[PDB]
Amino acid sequence: LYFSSLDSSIDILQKRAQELIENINKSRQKDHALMTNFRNSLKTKVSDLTEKLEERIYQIYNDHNKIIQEKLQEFTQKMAKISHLETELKQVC
Amino acid sequence: GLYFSSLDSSIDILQKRAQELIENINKSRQKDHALMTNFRNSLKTKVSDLTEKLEERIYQIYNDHNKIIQEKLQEFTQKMAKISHLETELKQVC
Amino acid sequence: DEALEKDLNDVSKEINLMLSTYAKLLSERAAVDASYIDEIDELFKEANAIENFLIQ
Amino acid sequence: KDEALEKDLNDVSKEINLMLSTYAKLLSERAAVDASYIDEIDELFKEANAIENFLIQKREFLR
Incomplete structure (x- = not known):
């Protein structure tokens, strides 16, 4: 009578042990999924951060190229003006 | 005559400096475009690698967890066997 | 140029914050595992109590 | 434990700061090269401008 009561205690202890091991397994699976998705x-x-960095650096380089092209075109026109002026002076002299 | 040739030489030096500068800019651009990809790599x-090291330390922690859990499970199984044998003794005696 | 400095520093800031948040996540999950260890301890206590009564 | 995690977090933060600072240096040097090229273009334009002034005053004297 007493022995059967402690027998139910024994059954509950062993079965609690099995259920607890299964809970640990599910907890490990949950932890692994959380780890992988957070890492991803x-x-x-x-x-995304590297993308925005490349975007801003590209804008800086584009502005640099715009400035370089403008200054080169202006220099080429100044050179043409000097060439025409000097040809005029050649004619005169 | 001499003045015109001197001024033509100055104008050409300007032309060659401009050409050289454009070539330098182009070569530098090829170089820098290689460098940027190297950074993204x-x-x-x-x-x-840093996430790797963090996970490595965690794996050490979980390995210690499994070691401790296995020791306690083995002792608990010993407790269950000991209690079962004691109970069998008491059952048979009574 | 100014924006490049700001965004470089902000990128480093965000990456460090994100990696520390990852570390915290990792610690919390390991803590849950340790809690299961303590549950095994409770089962051991119950086993020892039953054994003590059975001895006497 | 958590302590080891904190210390390696320090190493991680140090390494990320090191890489971002090295990248900043890389960009600073590249921008300096570009600025030097721009300054060279400006100097070339000034030389052209001086030559043009010379031709303009010679032409005005000839007329």
């Missing part, structure tokens, strides 16, 4: 979204966010 | 690889 982190890498995606880093890719 | 190294940034992603290093961030992955």
